[PDB]
């Protein structure tokens, strides 16, 4: 969805009226804007580049939040104040105690507006980056329990019997062999190394392709037996007590799954006060630059004719004509003022 | 002195294993960098310091940056350059506050 | 208080001359046209063309950056009055 | 002192050219030297002396392993400028060389 | 119609090309190399693979430099094993091969020249498969590269040299643009000589080429956000070559941003779903690691054509595969930073 906004000053805030009389293009509501603070010409122009610089940056923010919307688990329910976009457009006020009308427009207005939504920002990427961490370490979570006997964890394939624990001399070390290589190493695990303990086949699990054994070995022939199972395209997998901690890891399981259920919470609280805060700030520098640029292209008695507009679709190639014949009598890019805001976030 | 001696020392080993990372990704540049050297991109300036009347010499360092290797790679590899240029200036950053 | 500068620029151009400036500037100045005769010559910029005279007001002391840019766009000569 | 040397390696000075402390006046010599395998221990000493009494150098990078042959000439330089380092290499850790002036 | 000749001059030499493919660590030889703990022990672990003793000689400290340089003397003595029979559908086509490393090798004898430099930078410094150790007036020139490169066009990188001017060589073009304009002209040559020989070698080759052109399209539009080269210098340093040249090549001239070279990306679902490498997120595979993968993918699927040339090709690219994870083996040993040895490229 897009949306339109045109001021037209040149009675003549009965003439806009008369441009609601056009129904075939739009709806045409008013946008009542209360009166700003004058008494700059040379910094009033300056300032009019840095609200072009302002409102390209802040509906920045708004767009890369709209993105990341996906992340909490396309839908629109982005509210304002109780109030979808469309409704709160045609009803939109200065707040006048979040930006003051006593101040002057230019740079105190706009400061505070700046220094808020970019305070707003800041914490956005710094938060957000650090929930971002606990999914991609719980990418990780479901990474470890796939696979092979080889890559997968073993924290739920383990038993106590299944080792020779009392480190004195002996250490049981995990092989995992082929199934297609099952008769030459149930003929050879006695001579892969020397003192080889000859009776310790015992297939622990298997899967499609290959079988996880163990043998239990001496503790001085570790290496030669390794050594000689890769010459045979068997693989050792050392296995040691941090199972237990990975026991703390089957916790870790279940905490990076619930810190992922205990910040999805607070995530998306933190999204709908801020966005709604960073969309409202958002139409107030459009209000802002609608009040520049209207007392230069038109004139300044004392304030310019208000009036804003609302939004078409595929009949805005036509409303651009019926604008340009009624605005280029007016005057000796838009003949009039005008700022393109885009509703829909994506 | 002792501190950041050995903490030198991690920086000089991430700039080395960057290195191989880059010759992985792009040819071989042993001769390309050494060949093309005509001015300096980083220098030092003694600035003065004291102590109890003691003038002691301490270096500030400078970029009058005129990258001579701002095309390098470019063709195959290229981006494990500019993190290893940013691996070694923020070596050279640290080696000069150590000198 | 102030709001003066004027200089020299080709016959040819000063059509689009009024039309830019009246765009960037956005209204508020003043610009009356003067025209000179008989083709004369700066030496590199620029050669045998026959020039006018402009006066850009604005009087805004913030314009005049917004002007230098102009007269270097369009490639004009301006002299201290 | 304006300019840093390296004497280092074959895989540090490439590493530090790229860091852009490079330079080459024509007329006097290069700021560094790649010391390779058939290189004498003599070449390393002369380009020892020419760092310390040039005048733009005011840090030497070396590494260590190779400040391990021309530790005698490193002995014997007692001076503020120009400040000689010793850094780590590909192969070789590190620690020895400035704390003879402090025990 | 073309299968039932070429047994008459290149059938024995397409069994030797491909006997030395068996000889390419498979994945289980890559396992092998991953569990070791010292170069030392890697010299043994390397004497189970057809590569056997050849560190028998070299010293008792093995540096990781000279087993870089020793497993590349193996592959060009393979190389220059195969030059030396094929008659003349080959060896003009083994020729081509040669002369991307000719390229490298001419543009690192003109900076020395234009440093004052000679012969002492050239036999060293220089790749041995595109070598000159032949054409000896090229190795007698010290002039400063403008009485040289009139000795330059007496080398078979000739008909490359008609885009470069020699004027333009003497420090009016940039070092590194005189590479890829080179690299350019290189690429139409050698994708024009594999159209003219028909059949099996134009549908097993040409798909490599066509990568290989969006390679350099690719990469170049990227590594030339930061500097001053223009948008006119890059679109000329693109190759006439593959996929993307009447639409995406003037796409990559406009782009000024990472993001529009992603979308022109997306145009071609091939060369999407290589741009995740997402060097974003602090540890994966970047965006050449992608490409390499994908390189030695069409490599791979140059062995199942059977009576074509583009075997030989393949295999060169293949075996440089090799020399560059083993020794991305051996350094991640020998500085100890096994946490990342995992990140080679597994062709076989």
Same mark, same amino acid.
């Given at each position: 969805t897009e949306f339109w906004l045109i001021s037209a000053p040149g009675t003549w805030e009965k003439l806009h009226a008369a441009t609601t009389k056009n129904?075939?293009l739009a709806v045409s509501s008013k946008f009542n804007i209360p009166d700003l603070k004058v008494g700059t010409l040379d910094v009033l122009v300056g300032l009019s580049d840095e609200l072009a610089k302002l409102d390209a940056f802040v509906e920045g923010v708004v767009k890369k939040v709209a993105q990341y919307?996906?992340?909490?688990?396309?839908?629109?329910?982005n509210l304002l104040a109780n109030g979808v976009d469309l409704v709160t457009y045609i009803t939109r006020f200065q707040w006048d105690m979040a930006k003051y009308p006593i101040k002057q427009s230019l740079k105190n207005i706009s400061e505070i507006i700046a220094k808020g939504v970019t305070q707003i920002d800041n914490d956005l990427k710094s938060?957000?980056?650090?929930?971002?961490?606990?999914?991609?370490?719980?990418?990780?979570?479901?990474?470890?329990?796939?696979?092979?006997?080889?890559?997968?964890?073993?924290?739920?394939?383990?038993?106590?019997?299944?080792?020779?624990?009392?480190?004195?001399?002996?250490?049981?070390?995990?092989?995992?062999?082929?199934?297609?290589?099952?008769?030459?190493?149930?003929?050879?695990?006695?001579?892969?190394?020397?003192?080889?303990?000859?009776?310790?086949?015992?297939?622990?699990?298997?899967?499609?392709?290959?079988?996880?054994?163990?043998?239990?070995?001496?503790?001085?022939?570790?290496?030669?037996?390794?050594?000689?199972?890769?010459? =045979?395209?068997?693989?050792?997998?050392?296995?040691?007590?941090?199972?237990?901690?990975?026991?703390?890891?089957?916790?870790?399981?279940?905490?990076?799954?619930?810190?992922?259920?205990?910040?999805?919470?607070?995530?998306?609280?933190?999204l709908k006060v801020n966005f709604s805060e960073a969309f409202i700030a958002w139409i107030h520098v459009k209000a802002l630059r609608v009040f520049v640029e209207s007392v230069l292209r038109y004139g300044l008695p004392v304030n310019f004719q208000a009036m804003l507009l609302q939004p078409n679709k595929?009949t805005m190639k036509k409303l651009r004509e019926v604008l340009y014949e009624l605005y280029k009598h007016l005057d000796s890019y838009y003949p009039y003022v005008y700022y393109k805001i885009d509703c829909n976030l994506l | 002195?002792?501190?950041?001696?050995?903490?030198?020392?991690?920086?000089?080993?991430?700039?080395?294993?960057?290195?191989?990372?880059?010759?992985?990704?792009?040819?071989?540049?042993?001769?390309?960098?050494?060949?093309?050297?005509?001015?300096?991109?980083?220098?030092?300036?003694?600035?003065?310091?004291?102590?109890?009347?003691?003038?002691?010499?301490?270096?500030?360092?400078?970029?009058?940056?005129?990258?001579?290797?701002?095309?390098?790679?470019?063709?195959?590899?290229?981006?494990?350059?500019?993190?290893?240029?940013?691996?070694?200036?923020?070596?050279?950053?640290?080696?000069?506050?150590?000198? | 208080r102030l709001g003066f500068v004027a200089g020299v620029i080709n016959r040819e151009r000063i059509p689009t001359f009024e039309r830019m400036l009246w765009r960037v500037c956005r209204g508020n100045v003043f610009l009356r046209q003067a025209e000179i005769?008989?083709?004369?010559?700066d030496?590199?910029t620029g050669?045998?063309?026959?020039k006018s005279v402009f006066i850009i007001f604005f009087q805004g002391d913030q314009l005049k950056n917004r002007v230098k840019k102009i007269c270097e766009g369009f490639r004009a000569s301006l002299y201290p009055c | 002192?304006?300019?840093?040397?390296?004497?280092?390696?074959?895989?540090?000075?490439?590493?530090?050219?790229?860091?852009?402390?490079?330079?080459?006046?024509?007329?006097?010599?290069?700021?560094?030297?790649?010391?390779?395998?058939?290189?004498?221990? =003599?070449?390393?000493?002369?380009?020892?002396?020419?760092?310390? =009494?040039?005048?733009?150098?005011?840090?030497?990078?070396? =590494?260590?392993?190779?400040?391990?042959?021309?530790?005698?000439?490193?002995?014997?330089?007692?001076?503020?400028?120009?400040?000689?380092?010793?850094?780590?290499?590909?192969?070789?850790?590190?620690?020895?060389?400035?704390?003879?002036?402090?025990? | 119609?073309?299968?039932?000749?070429?047994?008459?001059?290149?059938?024995?030499?397409?069994?030797?090309?491909?006997?030395?493919?068996?000889?390419?660590?498979?994945?289980?030889?890559?396992?092998?190399?991953?569990?070791?703990?010292?170069?030392?022990?890697?010299?043994?672990?390397?004497?189970?693979?057809?590569?056997?003793?050849?560190?028998?000689?070299?010293?008792?400290?093995?540096?990781?430099?000279?087993?870089?340089?020793?497993?590349?003397?193996?592959?060009?003595?393979?190389?220059?094993?195969?030059?030396?029979?094929?008659?003349?559908?080959?060896?003009?086509?083994?020729?081509?091969?040669?002369?991307?490393?000719?390229?490298?090798?001419?543009?690192?004898?003109?900076?020395?020249?234009?440093?004052?430099?000679?012969?002492?930078?050239?036999?060293?410094?220089?790749?041995?498969?595109?070598?000159?150790?032949?054409?000896?007036?090229?190795?007698?020139?010290?002039?400063?590269?403008?009485?040289?490169?009139?000795?330059?066009?007496?080398?078979?990188?000739?008909?490359?040299?008609?885009?470069?001017?020699?004027?333009?060589?003497?420090?009016?073009?940039?070092?590194?643009?005189?590479?890829?304009?080179?690299?350019?002209?290189?690429?139409?040559?050698?994708?024009?000589?594999?159209?003219?020989?028909?059949?099996?070698?134009?549908?097993?080759?040409?798909?490599?080429?066509?990568?290989?052109?969006?390679?350099?399209?690719?990469?170049?539009?990227?590594?030339?956000?930061?500097?001053?080269?223009?948008?006119?210098?890059?679109?000329?340093?693109?190759?006439?070559?593959?996929?993307?040249?009447?639409?995406?090549?003037?796409?990559?001239?406009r782009?000024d941003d990472?993001e529009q070279?992603?979308?022109?990306?997306?145009?071609?679902?091939?060369?999407?779903?290589?741009?995740?490498?997402?060097?974003?997120?602090?540890?994966?595979?970047?965006?050449?690691?992608?490409?390499?993968?994908?390189?030695?993918?069409?490599?791979?699927?140059?062995?199942?054509?059977?009576?074509?040339?583009?075997?030989?090709?393949?295999?060169?690219?293949?075996?440089?595969?090799?020399?560059?994870?083993?020794?991305?083996?051996?350094?991640?040993?020998?500085?100890?930073?096994?946490?990342?040895?995992?990140?080679?490229?597994?062709?076989?």
């Open positions: 129904n075939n919307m996906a992340d909490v688990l396309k839908v629109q329910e938060r957000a980056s650090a929930y971002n961490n606990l999914k991609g370490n719980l990418q990780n979570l479901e990474r470890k329990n796939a696979g092979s006997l080889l890559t997968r964890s073993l924290a739920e394939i383990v038993k106590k019997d299944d080792f020779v624990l009392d480190s004195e001399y002996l250490v049981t070390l995990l092989v995992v062999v082929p199934k297609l290589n099952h008769n030459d190493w149930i003929k050879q695990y006695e001579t892969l190394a020397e003192m080889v303990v000859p009776r310790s086949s015992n297939v622990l699990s298997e899967d499609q392709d290959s079988y996880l054994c163990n043998v239990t070995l001496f503790r001085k022939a570790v290496d030669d037996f390794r050594h000689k199972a890769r010459e =045979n395209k068997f693989i050792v997998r050392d296995f040691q007590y941090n199972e237990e901690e990975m026991k703390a890891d089957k916790e870790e399981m279940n905490r990076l799954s619930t810190d992922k259920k205990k910040q999805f919470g607070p995530l998306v609280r933190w595929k | 002195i002792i501190e950041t001696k050995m903490l030198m020392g991690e920086v000089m080993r991430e700039a080395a294993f960057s290195l191989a990372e880059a010759k992985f990704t792009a040819g071989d540049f042993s001769t390309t960098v050494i060949q093309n050297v005509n001015k300096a991109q980083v220098k030092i300036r003694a600035k003065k310091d004291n102590v109890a009347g003691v003038t002691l010499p301490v270096f500030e360092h400078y970029h009058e940056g005129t990258d001579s290797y701002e095309l390098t790679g470019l063709a195959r590899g290229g981006e494990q350059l500019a993190k290893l240029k940013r691996n070694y200036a923020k070596a050279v950053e640290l080696l000069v506050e150590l000198a | 005769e008989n083709p004369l010559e030496p590199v050669d045998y063309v026959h | 002192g304006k300019l840093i040397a390296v004497i280092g390696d074959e895989d540090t000075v490439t590493g530090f050219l790229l860091g852009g402390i490079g330079e080459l006046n024509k007329n006097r010599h290069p700021n560094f030297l790649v010391v390779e395998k058939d290189t004498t221990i =003599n070449e390393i000493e002369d380009t020892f002396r020419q760092f310390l =009494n040039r005048d733009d150098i005011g840090i030497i990078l070396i =590494n260590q392993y190779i400040a391990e042959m021309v530790r005698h000439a490193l002995d014997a330089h007692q001076r503020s400028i120009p400040a000689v380092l010793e850094i780590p290499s590909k192969e070789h850790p590190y620690d020895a060389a400035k704390d003879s002036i402090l025990r | 119609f073309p299968e039932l000749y070429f047994n008459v001059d290149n059938g024995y030499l397409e069994g030797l090309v491909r006997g030395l493919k068996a000889g390419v660590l498979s994945q289980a030889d890559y396992l092998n190399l991953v569990q070791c703990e010292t170069l030392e022990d890697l010299k043994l672990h390397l004497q189970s693979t057809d590569y056997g003793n050849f560190l028998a000689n070299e010293a008792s400290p093995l540096t990781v430099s000279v087993i870089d340089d020793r497993l590349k003397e193996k592959m060009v003595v393979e190389f220059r094993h195969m030059r030396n029979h094929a008659y003349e559908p080959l060896a003009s086509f083994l020729d081509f091969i040669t002369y991307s490393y000719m390229i490298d090798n001419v543009i690192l004898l003109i900076t020395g020249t234009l440093h004052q430099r000679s012969i002492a930078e050239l036999v060293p410094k220089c790749h041995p498969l595109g070598s000159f150790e032949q054409m000896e007036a090229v190795n007698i020139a010290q002039t400063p590269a403008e009485l040289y490169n009139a000795i330059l066009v007496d080398t078979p990188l000739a008909a490359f040299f008609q885009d470069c001017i020699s004027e333009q060589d003497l420090d009016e073009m940039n070092i590194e643009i005189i590479r890829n304009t080179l690299y350019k002209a290189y690429l139409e040559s050698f994708y024009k000589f594999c159209t003219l020989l028909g059949g099996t070698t134009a549908d097993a080759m040409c798909p490599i080429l066509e990568f290989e052109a969006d390679r350099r399209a690719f990469i170049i539009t990227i590594n030339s956000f930061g500097t001053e080269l223009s948008k006119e210098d890059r679109a000329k340093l693109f190759p006439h070559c593959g996929r993307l040249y009447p639409e995406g090549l003037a796409q990559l001239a782009a990472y070279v992603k979308n022109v990306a997306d145009y071609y679902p091939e060369y999407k779903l290589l741009f995740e490498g997402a060097g974003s997120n602090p540890g994966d595979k970047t965006l050449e690691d992608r490409f390499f993968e994908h390189e030695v993918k069409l490599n791979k699927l140059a062995f199942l054509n059977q009576f074509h040339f583009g075997v030989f090709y393949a295999f060169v690219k293949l075996k440089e595969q090799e020399c560059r994870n083993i020794v991305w083996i051996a350094e991640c040993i020998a500085q100890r930073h096994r946490a990342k040895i995992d990140n080679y490229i597994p062709i076989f």
